């Protein structure tokens, strides 16, 4: 049974799952539009919107939290200079998930993930 | 037996003056509206049909819209009938309302709900079957069924044999529960003990059939 439970498994161990979602968040924050599978895209919101919420207040503890959670100095620098101040006055919902067909070699449902006010 | 339709809201406790804690379930009753009265002359039996709740008008079909507008009531989320007699069908009319004051403190009731669904389950959970040896040479047979019959007499498996399958999600009635409190301003019943289902599901409360 699975009553009222959150989270996914996606065929991985706990640590592999954590690493993969962290990698996805870093790639998204760099390129601002990425293509993934739809089940991976819908769980990325739950990982990547809290980081933007955190980057809205630029203190040393917040930046050290963001580095413990991203382990990427370029991402921490982009969050507290670009992405945080861009969404300072938006109340959640900083991403956008859009169904985009199926993968050729796989027949897997795919999706685009993009930032809201990009370009 | 005429009763109420409500929603299971949660489970609580009530301390008494003597210090005893009483486990209780809270049932929310939005007052029920009488949508139809079935009588011997046009139906063959006596019953009161009742609606409760609310529905948005874009989810009410034109047939149900006409049925609700034939009385005065507004469309609720479900419709349910109660078998009655006269001296119980006394002052009940379409456009009437049944509230929590139908019951009193200290009454015994039966509550019927829809129990939680456990999915496809095996013999150990569905029928309290015993497991086999865990480590004394046992190969791959721990929670399996074991024997299912005999040998060529009768040469078949009997009907009603206990096997694996779907568990839960049925209609279940619990008899013999007591009313602990009838709150009229919040429109709530509190009864003692556990009642079938999850929080938010539709339950039916009616006076006890044993007495």
């Amino acid at each position: 049974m699975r009553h009222r439970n959150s989270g996914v498994k996606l065929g991985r161990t706990s640590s592999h799952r954590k690493a993969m979602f962290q990698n996805l968040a870093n790639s998204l924050f760099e390129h601002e539009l990425i293509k993934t599978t739809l089940p991976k895209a819908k769980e990325l919101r739950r990982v990547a919107e809290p980081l933007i919420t955190l980057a809205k207040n630029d203190t040393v503890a917040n930046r050290r939290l963001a580095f413990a959670r991203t382990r990427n100095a370029a991402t921490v620098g982009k969050l507290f200079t670009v992405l945080g101040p861009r969404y300072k006055e938006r109340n959640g919902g900083y991403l956008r998930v859009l169904k985009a067909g199926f993968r050729a070699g796989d027949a897997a449902p795919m999706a685009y993930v993009e930032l809201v006010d990009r370009e | 037996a005429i009763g109420l339709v409500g929603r299971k809201c949660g489970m609580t406790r009530i301390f008494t003056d003597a210090g005893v804690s009483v486990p209780v379930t809270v049932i929310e009753v939005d007052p029920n509206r009488i949508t139809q009265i079935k009588t011997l002359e046009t139906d063959g039996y006596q019953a009161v049909q009742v609606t409760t709740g609310e529905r948005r008008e874009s989810r009410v079909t034109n047939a149900q819209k006409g049925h609700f507008a034939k009385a005065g009531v507004a469309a609720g989320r479900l419709v349910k009938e109660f078998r009655v007699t006269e001296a119980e069908l006394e002052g009940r009319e379409v456009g009437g309302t049944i509230g929590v004051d139908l019951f009193t403190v200290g009454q015994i009731v039966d509550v019927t709900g829809q129990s939680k669904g456990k999915g496809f389950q095996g013999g150990v959970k569905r029928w309290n079957f015993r497991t086999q040896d865990a480590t004394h040479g046992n190969s791959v047979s721990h929670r399996v069924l074991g024997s299912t019959g005999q040998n060529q007499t009768p040469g078949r498996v009997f009907k009603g044999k206990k096997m694996a399958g779907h568990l839960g999600d049925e209609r279940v009635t619990v008899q013999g529960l007591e009313i602990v409190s009838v709150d009229t301003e919040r429109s709530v019943l509190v009864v003692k003990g556990a009642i079938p289902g999850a929080t938010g599901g539709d339950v039916i409360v009616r006076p006890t059939i044993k007495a």
Partner: protein, 54 residues
């Protein structure tokens, strides 16, 4: 473990009577005029009045 008699060609076609395929939900995006899978981005990156990767 295994059959005692071969299956007639009629009982083999009776099992396959649930093997048929269905169509998908396709709509016309008269913002762009093309056919596309409902609720999906079109082949060139259009959805409900927006364009990705210009």
């Amino acid at each position: 473990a295994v059959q005692q008699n071969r299956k007639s060609r009629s009982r083999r076609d009776m099992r396959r009577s649930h093997d048929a395929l269905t169509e998908n939900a396709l709509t016309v995006d008269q913002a762009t005029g093309e056919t596309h899978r409902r609720h999906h981005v079109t082949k060139d990156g259009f959805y409900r009045g927006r364009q990705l990767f210009a």
